[PDB]
Ligand binder design. Structure first.
Ligand SMILES: Cc1cc2c(cc1S(=O)(=O)NCc1ccc(F)cc1)n(C)c(=O)n2C
Length: 103
């Protein structure tokens, strides 16, 4: 039980982070040219939240795979010095940081 509890804590702290604005909702491919073609498996914090409330995470590690997917997609699509990229680096470092001081 404590596994998914810590997932709730981490996901809530990510949802409310100052750098979280790019990842709160699915990327709108109609508005981001090329995103559909470049990113095979989109992921975002609201999709993770919907899946977590609905109970659809078996382990803490599937959760961590979805978070890492958020940041891998970010680095794949955005230059490291773009605004979304800078936000994504702050969020990724925050996630690995929080994740490790649990497990
Ligand atoms: C919020 C956001 C998150 C992103 C993103 C772009 C944006 S956004 O700020 O540009 N929103 C789309 C948009 C809005 C108005 C426009 F006129 C044009 C585009 N990318 C390229 C990503 O990988 N993530 C996660």
């Amino acid at each position: 039980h404590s596994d998914l509890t810590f997932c709730e804590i981490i996901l809530m702290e990510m949802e409310s982070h100052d750098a979280a604005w790019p990842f709160l909702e699915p990327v709108n491919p109609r508005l981001v040219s090329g995103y559909r073609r470049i990113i095979k498996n989109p992921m975002d914090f609201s999709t993770m939240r919907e899946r977590l409330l609905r109970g659809g995470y078996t382990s803490s590690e599937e959760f961590a795979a979805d978070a890492l997917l958020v940041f891998d997609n970010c680095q794949t699509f955005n230059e490291d010095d773009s605004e979304v990229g800078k936000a994504g680096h702050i969020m990724r470092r925050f996630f690995e940081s929080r994740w490790e001081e649990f497990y």
